[PDB]
Design a protein around this nucleic acid. Structure first.
Ligand SMILES: Nc1ncnc2c1ncn2[C@H]1C[C@H](O)[C@@H](COP(=O)(O)OP(=O)(O)OP(=O)(O)O)O1
Ligand SMILES: [Mg+2]
Ligand code: NA
Ligand code: NA
Length: 300
DNA sequence: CCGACAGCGCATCAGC
DNA sequence: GCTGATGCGC
DNA sequence: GTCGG
């Protein structure tokens, strides 16, 4: 776009730090810089101009100058042609394979999806599912499909027990036209702070063949795979069982957005409770914590 | 100069 | 067998 | 990598 070349450069640098160098803080640093630049409504003419923005320091300013003068970045060019770094970076696209597993695989010659297929015994359950739905997991989910997925979830949950309260949060609740996955928050009157509710819900969704695979499952959090009945790509779905008195704080947090949660927290609010500067305050709705904006306007 | 940068649920490893 | 650390995703 | 004590 205006600075798409710069933001793509920073994003690519971010991924290298995360996946190859294992520098999570430098990763977030590049992303923060890429984020502020993407929102900047001017054609950047120099690194000095960008350095005025928060999150952009000397090193990135120098990289921008090189980019604006050459149209590329020498360091990135070398990284792209490097077999080891590129293979490590690519393997991290598989769900369940992080920087550690990726580096470990590449060390022993395993560099591609094909290599992963003929090495199945070297992969855990999560990684196998990640390999199986590699393409599907990188697909976006249209809102129309999300609506259909929501129809099934709310219907089956209410069938298990009409006392349940389920809310699909994330970008979908914010009214987005597409979503990366489905985040479902679940609660029940019999479950308050420190009081098999999640299991029965998961089982029912597996019974109607909505949930197809399981990445992780515990007493409060489920991570798995689902698919609409036909063809349809397999989708990532998370289900969290949350106490009733911590439910709406969770709804607020998991609704987002990222910038909104950060802004609302600064102006203590965490995913669980809200406390004065102290003991958790009684919250029975999203409006309550606001009193101490509709999801469609929660971008920042 | 130098520490913070989100924190936690679950799976699986490291070690006793 | 167990506890704690680590990896991972979010 | 950037920010700020
Ligand atoms: N780093 C974070 N800080 C605060 N809240 C976060 C963070 N990461 C995720 N969340 C919360 C806000 C999001 O709405 C909620 C769901 O995470 P996400 O699924 O990443 O939101 P999204 O659903 O808007 O992304 P997408 O549309 O790509 O799935 O989790
Ligand atoms: Mg989401
Ligand atoms: Na700056
Ligand atoms: Na991964």
């Amino acid at each position: 776009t205006l600075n798409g070349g710069i933001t793509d450069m920073l994003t690519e640098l971010a991924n290298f730090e995360k996946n190859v160098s294992q520098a999570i803080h430098k990763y977030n640093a590049y992303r923060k810089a890429a984020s502020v630049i993407a929102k900047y409504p001017h054609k950047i003419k120099s690194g000095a101009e960008a350095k005025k923005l928060p999150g952009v320091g000397t090193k990135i300013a120098e990289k921008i100058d090189e980019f604006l003068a050459t149209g590329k970045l020498r360091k990135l060019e070398k990284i792209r042609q490097d077999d080891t770094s590129s293979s490590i970076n690519f393997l991290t696209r598989v769900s369940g394979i992080g920087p550690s597993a990726a580096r470990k695989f590449v060390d022993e010659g395993i560099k591609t999806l094909e290599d992963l297929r003929k090495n199945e015994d070297k992969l855990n359950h999560h990684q196998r599912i990640g390999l199986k739905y590699f393409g599907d997991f990188e697909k976006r989910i249209p809102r129309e499909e999300m609506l259909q997925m929501q129809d099934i979830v709310l219907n089956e949950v209410k069938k298990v027990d009409s006392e349940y309260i389920a809310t699909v949060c994330g970008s979908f609740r914010r009214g987005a036209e597409s979503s990366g996955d489905m985040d479902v928050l679940l609660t029940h009157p019999s479950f308050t702070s420190e009081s098999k509710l999640l299991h029965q819900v998961v089982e029912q969704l597996q019974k109607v063949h909505f949930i197809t695979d399981t990445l992780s499952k515990g007493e409060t959090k489920f991570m798995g795979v689902c698919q609409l009945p036909s063809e349809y790509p397999h989708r990532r779905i998370d289900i969290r069982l949350i106490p009733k008195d911590q439910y709406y704080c969770g709804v607020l947090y998991f609704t987002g957005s990222d910038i909104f949660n950060k802004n609302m927290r600064a102006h203590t609010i965490n995913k669980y409770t809200i406390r004065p500067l102290g003991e958790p305050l009684p919250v029975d709705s999203e409006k309550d914590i606001f009193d101490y904006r509709e999801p469609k306007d929660r971008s920042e």
